[PDB]
């Protein structure tokens, strides 16, 4: 869990040594310094260097963006600050001019596309070539209110000396006035009296012949993407051919800026120094040796663990043996639990793959899941990233390893529960002389037959609800344990009240369906509800009464562990039945056809419902379990420790 991180609040003397201490720490190890009793930052040169470094860092980020690639830590850039800036600014400015060109050309093609069709229609109706002294001015009026308005305007102007070119178009109309030699002067006034001028073009062709200008615009639109595509691939080459220096500079800059922003908090206190720090005990010897060997600073100062004083400032980093470490994915993203309170990383491996096994069958899908496991294990053996268009999955080997261990747990428990269910009804219906088969009169697998919903039902669902009881009770008892540790009377009484009321209603169900033993049950139920009422009284939050129904809902909610299993299992059973049925309807050709179609339907139902199967038990852990002992209420300061990024070299 927390591995009991402990304050290492040293105190160096020499202010001129602080840069040295931090240049040590950042390459050495992790401390996650707080903001305790902070003071100034040595403004004159330190502010300047911080400014230049954050500038070059975000510049690397910006040119990486424009180059298409994302941010990545590769290698430091030790060639100097002046040289860093003078080796960034050329490449950044080159790419900036490049994207300027690209976006200008995108805009140009956009404008050409917008202007094309109306100009095209005008040109089509530009039968009268626009060379002649008597002119052809171009309006773009609508359809409905078009005719009378411009007609009356042109009549007030002259007496039918004008000519109109009306043609339907995506717009209203492509209206077009044919004007005499010098009539254009007053015709502009007339149309402005109607409210229209001539449709001016982008400007580089607002004076050319419209017919010719139409072909010009068509040609530009027909060539713009080609130019756009070529400048795009040009930018892409520029990206590829120098990206190394980009990420290198980005790394070096991030190191420097983290160092300076840390110093900003560090140059603090009422003496020549002040500092606090958080390092895990399992790293304390390493940070101590790293401080002593290189620096052997004036002095350090180590502190105790202060289990709870504020409970926020203290960071957390979940540790666990590789017996249960890979599962950390399955608890990480939901929350980070505060220091003190429990860590559910170790409980998931005990249940999740086991439940998954309880859902599917060995001969059923353990074989193919292990095939997938072999595929992914080879994928990590070559140590390559996973690249699939389904999303921005960059599954590094340090993820694929965890996944293959998780899938191994899952597939082992599925192997187990398979023979317990004797799955692939087909392969059992085909031949398993070892245990009672459907073809046998007495059909019995090793222990229980999930394909038989009559005999095994109540047993299996009672087993599922038993998983529920044990897990939920562990949750509530853990809530109470933490209310004791954290010394919160409300927490403890509420937890024990839910526990009591829940066992009360459980024994109530027992009596209501199973048996009748008064002192065993009636007294048990009475005292359970009594401790529940004692709790709601001496806690006075009284939200138990609403939530107690929800808690019984939770303990029941583990029926699905059997439900999804029954659904999928006997689905596969009936599909195999159809396969052998079609194999029997015809001959050996029918057998091949039926096996193929059964396998196809199986693959379909598999790639469909396997995600729901994978997702149920883990959501039982996510919401049925974690909600009770407290896992979404607070959130401890996540472990963001002082370090050179370097992919944690």
């Amino acid at each position: 869990p927390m591995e009991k991180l402990v304050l290492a609040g040293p105190k160096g003397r020499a202010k001129e040594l602080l840069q040295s201490l931090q240049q040590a720490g950042v390459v050495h190890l992790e401390t996650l310094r707080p903001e305790a009793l902070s003071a100034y930052q040595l403004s004159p040169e330190e502010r300047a260097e911080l400014r230049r470094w954050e500038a070059v860092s975000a510049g690397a980020e910006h040119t990486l963006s424009l180059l298409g690639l994302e941010a990545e830590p590769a290698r430091p850039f030790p060639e100097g600050l002046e040289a860093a800036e003078k080796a960034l600014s050329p490449i950044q400015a080159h790419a900036e001019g490049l994207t300027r060109q690209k976006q200008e050309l995108e805009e140009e093609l956009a404008l050409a596309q917008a202007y094309l069709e109306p100009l095209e229609r005008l040109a089509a109706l530009a039968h009268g070539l626009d060379k002649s002294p008597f002119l052809r001015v171009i309006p773009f009026l609508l359809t409905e209110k078009e005719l009378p308005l411009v007609e009356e305007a042109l009549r007030k102007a002259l007496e039918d000396r004008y000519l109109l070119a009306h043609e339907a178009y995506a717009g209203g109309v492509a209206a077009l006035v044919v004007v005499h030699r010098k009539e254009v002067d007053q015709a502009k006034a007339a149309l402005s009296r109607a409210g229209v001028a001539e449709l001016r073009l982008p400007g580089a062709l607002g004076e050319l012949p419209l017919s010719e200008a139409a072909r010009r615009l068509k040609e530009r639109a027909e060539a713009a993407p080609r130019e756009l595509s070529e400048v795009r691939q040009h930018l892409a080459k520029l990206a590829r051919e120098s990206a190394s220096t980009l990420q290198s500079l980005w790394t070096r800059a991030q190191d420097e800026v983290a160092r300076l922003k840390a110093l900003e908090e560090l140059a603090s206190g009422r003496f020549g120094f002040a500092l606090l720090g958080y390092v895990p005990v399992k790293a304390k010897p390493k940070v101590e040796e790293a401080l002593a060997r290189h620096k052997e600073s004036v002095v350090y100062a180590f502190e105790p663990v202060d289990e709870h004083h504020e409970a926020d400032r203290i960071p957390v980093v979940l540790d666990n043996p590789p017996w249960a470490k890979p599962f950390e994915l399955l608890v990480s993203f939901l929350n980070t639990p505060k220091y003190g309170t429990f860590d559910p990383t170790p409980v998931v491996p005990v249940f999740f793959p086991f439940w998954f096994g309880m859902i599917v069958g060995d001969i059923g899908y353990a074989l193919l899941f292990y095939l997938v496991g072999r595929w992914l294990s080879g994928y990590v053996k070559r140590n390559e990233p996973l690249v699939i268009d389904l999303f921005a999955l960059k599954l590094k080997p340090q993820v694929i390893g965890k996944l293959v261990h998780i899938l191994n747990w899952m597939v082992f428990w599925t192997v187990v529960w398979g023979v317990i269910y004797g799955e692939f009804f087909g392969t059992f219906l085909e031949h398993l002389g070892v245990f009672g088969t459907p073809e046998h009169p007495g059909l019995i697998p090793i222990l229980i037959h999930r394909i038989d919903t009559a005999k095994t039902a109540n047993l299996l669902i009672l087993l599922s609800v038993a998983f529920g009881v044990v897990l939920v009770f562990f949750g509530l008892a853990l809530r109470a344990y933490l209310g004791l540790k954290h010394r919160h009377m409300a927490h403890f009484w509420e937890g024990v009240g839910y526990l009591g009321g829940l066992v009360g209603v459980l024994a109530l169900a027992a009596s209501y369906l199973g048996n009748l033993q008064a002192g065993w049950l009636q007294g048990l139920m009475y005292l359970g509800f009594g401790v529940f009422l004692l709790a709601v009284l001496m806690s006075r939050i009284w939200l138990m009464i609403p939530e107690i129904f929800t808690q019984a809902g939770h303990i029941l909610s583990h029926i699905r562990i059997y439900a999804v299993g029954a659904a999928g299992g006997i689905l596969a059973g009936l599909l195999t039945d159809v396969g052998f049925a079609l194999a029997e309807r015809l001959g050996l050709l029918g057998v091949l056809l039926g096996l193929l179609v059964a396998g196809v339907l199986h693959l379909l139902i598999l790639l469909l419902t396997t995600l729901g199967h994978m997702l149920q038990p883990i959501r039982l852990l996510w919401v049925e379990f974690f909600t009770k002992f407290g896992f979404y209420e607070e959130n401890g300061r996540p472990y963001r420790p002082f370090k050179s990024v370097r992919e944690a070299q």
Partner: peptide, 20 residues
């Protein structure tokens, strides 16, 4: 029609050019 009338009112300029 009105188009022919406007065309004649315009070709008056061509007639003037030919007379010039």
């Amino acid at each position: 029609s009105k188009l022919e009338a406007i065309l004649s009112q315009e070709v008056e300029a061509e007639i003037q050019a030919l007379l010039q």
